[PDB]
């Protein structure tokens, strides 16, 4: 399984979401699925970002919370967690 690499910005995002009532149950499920290099279920709308943001990927944990991540070598890197319009 990939090792987990939580970027400082992700940790801060995550703490902010929690403080505002975010339930991380599904997120933890998704992260495990990503670490196992398995495909996410349709609901998450997992895709690759384009342009300046290659090769990062995005999925929607909730309709209004996106996880931005990258698999590189033997790490799953978690970069950002939050609404798309807040992250970009």
Q: Is 60 labelled a binding residue?
A: no
What CATH number does the domain located at 1-88 have? 3.30.2310.20
Domain locations in the chain as residue ranges: 1-88
Sequence-ordered strand ranges (E) for the chain = 3-6, 47-48, 57-62, 65-72, 75-82
Q: How far apart are CA 63 and CA 32, in angstroms?
A: 20
The answer to whether the CB of 31 falls within 8 A of the CB of 4 is: yes
Q: How far apart are CA 52 and CA 30, in angstroms?
A: 25
Q: Is 38 labelled a binding residue?
A: no
Spatial CA neighbour of 28 closest among 47, 14, 42, 16? 14
Experimental resolution (Å): 1.9
CA geometry: angle 54, 44, 17, nearest 5 deg: 85
Q: How far apart are CA 42 and CA 45, in angstroms?
A: 6
Residues marked active site are found at: 84
Q: What is the CA radius of gyration of the chain?
A: 12
């Amino acid at each position: 399984m990939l090792k987990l690499n939580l970027k400082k910005s992700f940790q801060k995002d995550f703490d902010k979401l929690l403080l505002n009532g975010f339930d991380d149950s599904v997120l933890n499920e998704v992260i495990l699925t990503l670490r196992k290099k398995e495909p996410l279920d349709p609901q998450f709308q997992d895709h690759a970002l384009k342009g300046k943001w290659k090769p990062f990927r995005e999925c929607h944990i909730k309709p209004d919370v996106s996880l931005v991540y990258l698999v590189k070598d033997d790490e799953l890197i978690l970069l950002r967690l939050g609404s798309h319009s807040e992250l970009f």
